[PDB]
């Protein structure tokens, strides 16, 4: 589990969104596994606006943050899971690292701020849903 709290937005994996998230919906995209809902309180996270390919992510199944090198956001075939059939997920970045299903939501960050959240995994890989192109998270 896990979310990004920036401004009056909450960014979560679409497959982990709650009824309150759907009832206060700002934007959602199944092909990216992302959903954004509105919040009453202002958050403290800031979004990275860069093309870094190195950063650090939180892994809840190890209670640890790991440094990683990750690929640029792209269209990748992801195997079937409990939440989606096997399909192409867009804006996904891959790294070598530990991830279990419940690790979804962990933040990936670089020197500039939050880059994305854990979305996929398996066999020593971890995939992150990028948020650096969502410029509207910084305003309104």
Ligand X SMILES: COc1ccccc1CC(=O)N1CCO[C@@H](C(N)=O)C1
Q: Nearest 5°: phi and psi at 112?
A: -95, -20
Cα dihedral 2→119→72→39 (10° resolution): -40
| 81 is a contact residue toward ligand X (CB under 6 A) | yes
Quote the DSSP letter at residue 132. Answer: T
For Zn ion, the binding residues in 84-123 under the rule CB under 5 A are: 110, 112
Look at residue 37 and give the partner it binds from Zn ion, ligand X, none, a contact being a CB closer than 5 to 8 Å depending on partner kind: none
To 5 degrees, how large is the angle CA 92–CA 121–CA 118? 55
Give the x/- contact pattern for ligand X in 98-127, rule: CB under 6 A. Answer: -xxx-xx-------------xxxxx-----
Question: Which of 22, 38, 50, 102 is the binder for Zn ion (CB under 5 A)?
Answer: 50
First to last CA, the chain: 26
| 15 is a contact residue toward ligand X (CB under 6 A) | yes
Question: Which of 16, 52, 56, 76 is the binder for Zn ion (CB under 5 A)?
Answer: 52
| 45 is a contact residue toward ligand X (CB under 6 A) | no
Task: Indicate if 130 belongs to the active site.
Answer: no
Residue 83 DSSP SS3: coil
Task: Indicate if 45 belongs to the active site.
Answer: no
Give the annotated binding-site residues: 50, 52, 110, 112
């Amino acid at each position: 589990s896990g979310a990004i709290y920036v401004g009056n937005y909450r960014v979560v994996n679409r497959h982990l969104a709650t009824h309150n998230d759907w009832a206060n919906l700002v934007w959602e995209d199944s092909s990216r596994d992302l959903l954004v809902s509105s919040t009453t309180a202002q958050g403290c996270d800031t979004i990275a606006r860069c093309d870094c390919q190195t950063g650090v992510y939180y892994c809840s199944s190890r209670r640890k943050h790991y440094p990683v090198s990750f690929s640029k956001p792209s269209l990748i075939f992801v195997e079937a899971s409990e939440y989606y059939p096997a399909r192409y997920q867009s804006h996904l970045m891959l790294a070598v690292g530990h991830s279990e299903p419940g690790d979804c939501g962990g933040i990936l960050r670089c020197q500039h701020g939050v880059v994305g959240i854990v979305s996929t995994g398996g066999n020593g890989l971890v995939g992150f849903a990028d948020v650096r192109d969502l410029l509207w998270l910084d305003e309104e």
